[model samples]
Target chain A: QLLESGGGLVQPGGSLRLSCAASGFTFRYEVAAWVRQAPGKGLEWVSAISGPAPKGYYADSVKGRFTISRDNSKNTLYLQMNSLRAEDTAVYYCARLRADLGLYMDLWGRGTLVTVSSASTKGPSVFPLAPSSKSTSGGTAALGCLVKDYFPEPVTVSWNSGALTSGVHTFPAVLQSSGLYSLSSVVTVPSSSLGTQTYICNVNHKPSNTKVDKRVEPK
Target chain B: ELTQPPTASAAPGQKVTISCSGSSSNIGNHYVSWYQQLPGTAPKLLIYDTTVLSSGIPDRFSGSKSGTSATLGITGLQTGDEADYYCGTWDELTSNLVFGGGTKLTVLGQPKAAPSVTLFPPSSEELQANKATLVCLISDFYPGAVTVAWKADSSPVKAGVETTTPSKQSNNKYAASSYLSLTPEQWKSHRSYSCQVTHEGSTVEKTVAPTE
Candidate 1:
């Protein structure tokens, strides 16, 4: 697996270093690349490294400000950049390059978000609130949904096609150690209605124009 | 223009060569490099600057250039050396990089493993008053290439068959899936449905009879 880490808020003109760690293969023998995507924009190639005796190739757009390197012993690839600006705010991804027909990205890593701003504002990461059957007597089920890690929070949560008003509860947003906010909600409903009717959780964070939904259905 | 043979093959312990033909604007005027792209992985630099091997690349892999043409050769070929090879160089005239069409190298004589095939019957809900789909899962094969065919009883099925490209699994093996669609009436008429997978010159099949 190729896992990405080490990206967060950064101030203008500051430097940032992102990492992609790998396992289950010989790290030094493989070629690695870094690509980035701005908000609602297409992918942009940053740089690529051949191996431990790595030869570096870079895109002209970030030629001098960006660099690609690797640590063979740790099985990790690094992307270091400086002279950050607001335009640099984006999600960065690491990928394996395929050069058969052309230089294509094969296996990819989950991207890490990097923000270059004075006062960072990010949307919440919403998760699906799957309803699990509870109650030993087997009539009702409990469902919980969580929205985590959003800055400048004043989020709203609602259930679409509301049914059970008595057992529904929405918790207040709490500040996290990382200077982000998290909120959660819970609801209880009869077991017979679990698969028959859909329970959709809608979360609205207006500042980011983020409208997220989570629903549960029968397997 | 850059050109390369479409495909090349050789048994293990043998020598194979891939040739790239170009012109003075590219291969002749600039340094040539070769890349190896294995399945499910990115391309790695093998040889750069015509004859210089990339760091950590073995001596068995070599490159040579003469006039406007270049060649990438592998000696004592191993099964792991099977991959696609591409030649690249800079064109002085266009001030741009150019690449060959690429050549696929197949190393034979390695042990071949047949895939484990599983046939899943369509669910009643999947029927949904229309066509139902039957799934054939093929897993754990060597050489990473296979052919899938569907059959209804003794008759070969050509229509409504779809097979996905082979995917590399976590175990460094390969897996693929095939789907066969059938109308409710056509499904009920057949006594059994079969999925046949062929790999490395042999074939294995999984059969499922109608349920309900």
Candidate 2:
């Protein structure tokens, strides 16, 4: 199900509430997970809340103004965002975690559409950067990566230069019931890199194999 | 209204045919009986099957033997056209007369066994009224051995009753009716009123209020 946005502008600090409704299940007993996705991109887990509990977990980056809740009596779950921004424009979905394994969400509802437009001036544009051998000051750059699909476990995003450059990465909280898995990592390159580099987003799934290394370069 | 005991004695190898007619109330009488015939003599009634009487006939003559139609055919014709052939069977009501109209048997050769008899109608329904005319109809019977009766509280109804022989439809299913005039009050309060049909040995009956 594709949801198109109704073009509208929101001022900073304005409130926005995005919701996802699910049928065909008893919602009161199941947990609802919320995941966000940029247009034509993969999914990132945002957060998950137990039914009507109001207490849940989320990635540090999306902690502000992102609240997940549900009205079990009505069988509806909600994701409300206050202080909206253009960066918040993404699709949200509600998912349920499989019963056998509490970690994986086997069922997902078609995501609800939500777009955040800034009424104020636009923010600085960010571009994806590859690993390179250049001076620290000269090699520093921001890489943009969109999660096109949801994967349950935590994934590692690394910049594989001659050696791995470690940096702070944020794991977006997964909404298991809504089937959304999202995470982001910001890596800084040390000086002495000056050429195109490859950064990989790797997901380690158990049992058979490991999914890793989605390559993105400076655009 | 005459009641005669069915002839039971019959020599081996005889032919017999029995005939019975319904009263005006039970016209198109469905019940019939068959008998056996001996040399140069009246047919010995074997079975007073449905409407026909063959009760007293010897074991050589059988009664209620087959399905619906009453049949009496001799196997080897003996010298027996001289005797009168009689068959007994009742109408819609059990108490109704079992007609025994006679059929002559022209025995040609040696005496033969009787052909099998088949019963029919299997069921019947009756309706009755005391003052105003009442009508009863029966349907869905094969070989159409059916009769209708109008009785006032278990007794044989008096005269002035008219009945129609069952009429066959395009499908060849038969239906019959009988009517009697009665007072509206008698029609309403009449008790033990019944519509009875004689088919085979089994009698099917339905009772209802005369009016409404």
Candidate 3:
């Protein structure tokens, strides 16, 4: 029979449950081997097991949080985990021993992608400061965007200043241990090229699929 | 970064020594670690906190370090102990863990003797299927190679049979298994079936009778 598992995501310290249902092989003869796969990362072994008092090895990586078990009558394998972390995001698969040549199923379900994120999403705090005066009359001026308290990673940025669709300079995002990330970019404006260009900072964060924009007036 | 010999070859039961080398930026300052990795599963943690710990290779393995250098020793080697070992430590320069490629230790071995054959009986579920399967377990072997063939009533049975590629056991020896599938009635009133394992050009055959 085909193997299966339920799907979902959770925050750190929450509980997660996974199950695999087998239909084809006779449980009395073969066993289900539990496995883990991380996105863009190598597969990690969780355990080799069978239903009804299944005993197997737990990889050191999953020792404290993962527990594997099975229900014989239901022909189902179960995985229960707690104290989850962002690292807990992964796909779980099943391997089985075969009766012929005893060749086990090297294959398992493609993957059930489960994700774990911090419970809190204090979206990135984005703001712009007074323009750094540079262009005289019609010369160039630098506008800055300061971001803080954002997480998970990769906060995209954009600038909206009239038809001047170009970025002058940008720096890499620096992640702070406080689960917050901050970065700044300067947009140049020259009134001489046209007129006074209003600099607007637009930031999009995936941690919440949300965006924030900050526009500052010279004070 | 850590450095190690590309390959280390030693005879069974002989004393073999290997080392992991690192510079002051890494292993030279951090606790050096060694890991033994067999095929399949992932690399296990053999050492932690800089020196070999309780879970390491035990008394047979000793660790020593001098400025910019660390060594791992094995006094009595065995075939089961043959595995690619790696060295890992923290690298302050990269702000990441650094590891040596791998030292694949080869355990010298002689051609194995013919393996003993054990033919297990078929179960009731298989019998009722009309199609029945039998298993052959060959153990206490060496050199990690073999062949299997099926025969019925003194005649060769070429089809409906399968054998696994020879697999190594932890003890540096090898073990393999094969299977034959036939109708439960194939031999109910006639010839019995046999499974044979051929190793090093010699063969050992064993048979199982049909359900009585």
Candidate 4:
């Protein structure tokens, strides 16, 4: 069974409603979970509201401004969002939780491509932090790079610390209420070895083929 | 537009195929959709309408429509292929969509015993931190392909009726439980509640009047 929805685009700060209908399933037996994929971006968890009642789990990011409900008589699921933004342009997909478990999507929908800006998409802000002693590298320190407010994500975060260019683990990207992204990663560096030990956060803005670097140095 | 065998079985390495009959309103008029459903999961599209295989479908799997009927063939039958197969199409005559009765395919050289089913009486135990509810316990089933539906005297039991997903239990068996929260007046009418279950391939009906 699969769910169906009709998607559209709107101006920034505008409001829009989205709906999805499920077929071939006893709506009460199967749990319906919702997921979203921003244009060219990776998938994101948008929360779940299924079962006999309007009760289930909810993701922190989609807690407010989004309502997920189902109409049993019509055999359908509904989603409504308010105060849309440019980054709200995404493919919103609804999946039915199979009897197997939570980690799988048994039945799903053909996505609705929601376009917000008739204009081009946008990227995030680069917020880099000064090198700290968090680096376990015997003789060096680590710098923190915070990349915030990126639109149309799938952003990659890396660093340049010469010999210390390792352990660049990127944290999970959080979708803020503003429909933007906040992501951060760490890079190790040596404070006393050289001048401005070059610890920079590099971003591959894939959409526009653009590159951004937020470099942080020690005082 | 489609009809399937109630059951099918074949040994490994044996070619196992099923036939779907359609009418002028269906396969004779439009593409027939074929899907393979594994137990406790969703249906995966094997063929998207006639003759065309879905992406990643094995070459051993194929389909064809002749005149009014369509055939889904799975060659070199394997244990993993043991499951349910279904066909669907739009009934041009009825101007509506229709699906075939599901066909369960069992692997040969295995125990093909039907699951044992028992319907327990309704227990009116009100658990702590919970409102009043009626509980139905259906237990001890094997080869777990089972489904349940709740019904009133006439219509189905929807509101305040919640059923659990068929759950696998210890000892390699399956069990299911559900709770019903009915209004005070409906509880008094006691009008009957039918706990109908379809296990293996046959269906049975049992009615219960809650302890007032």
Model 2 TM-score, 2 decimals: 0.26
Identify the leading candidate in terms of DockQ: 1
Clashes of 3: 8
lDDT of 1 by residue, A1-219 (tens): 677776676778989888888866655777787867665343456787786476788866677788788887878888988888988787787877644433445466767778777767689866543443311112566554556568654566788745545555554454554666666555657777776767777877754657887664433
Give a tens-digit lDDT track for model 2, residues A29-86: 7766665555533334577776546787675447867887776665676666777776
Name the regions of candidate 3 deviating beyond 4 angstroms.
Answer: A1-219, B1-7, B19-29, B37-45, B49-60, B64-70, B78-84, B91-106, B109-113, B153-158, B170-172, B185-190
lDDT by residue for model 3 (A1-219), tens: 345455454687888777777666655346666656555344445655544466755666677577877766766777887888878677666656321322123335534556687545557756553442321111554455555456554455677733444633333444444545555444556644323556677776744557777775563
lDDT of 4 by residue, A1-219 (tens): 465445654667766666776656666666777766564233445657658797756555656767777777766777777667766677777776432311334356765656666444567555444443321223655445555456654566666623444534444454444565555555444547536345667775554445787666552
Which is the better candidate, 1 or 4, if ranked by lDDT? 1
Expressed as tens digits, the lDDT of each residue in B1-212 for candidate 4 is 46878678888888887888877777787777677766433356677646767668898888888888878898888777876787766566653335677678877674433433222222222222223344444444666576767777757777765555555433334555444555545654656676677877776565555441
Evaluating just chain A, the predictions reach TM-scores of 0.61, 0.46, 0.49, 0.49
CA lDDT of B20 in candidate 3?
Answer: 82
Q: Deviation in angstroms for B92 in model 3?
A: 4.9
The candidate scoring highest on lDDT is 1
Worst 10 residues of 1 chain A by lDDT: A129-138
The local lDDT score (0 to 100) that residue A64 gets in candidate 2 is 60
Cα lDDT of all candidates, in order?
A: 0.70, 0.42, 0.60, 0.59
Off by over 4 Å in 2: A1-9, A99-102, A119-219, B1-212
User: How good is the docking of model 3, by CAPRI class?
Assistant: incorrect
Against the native complex, each candidate's DockQ, computed on alpha carbons, is 0.02, 0.00, 0.01, 0.01
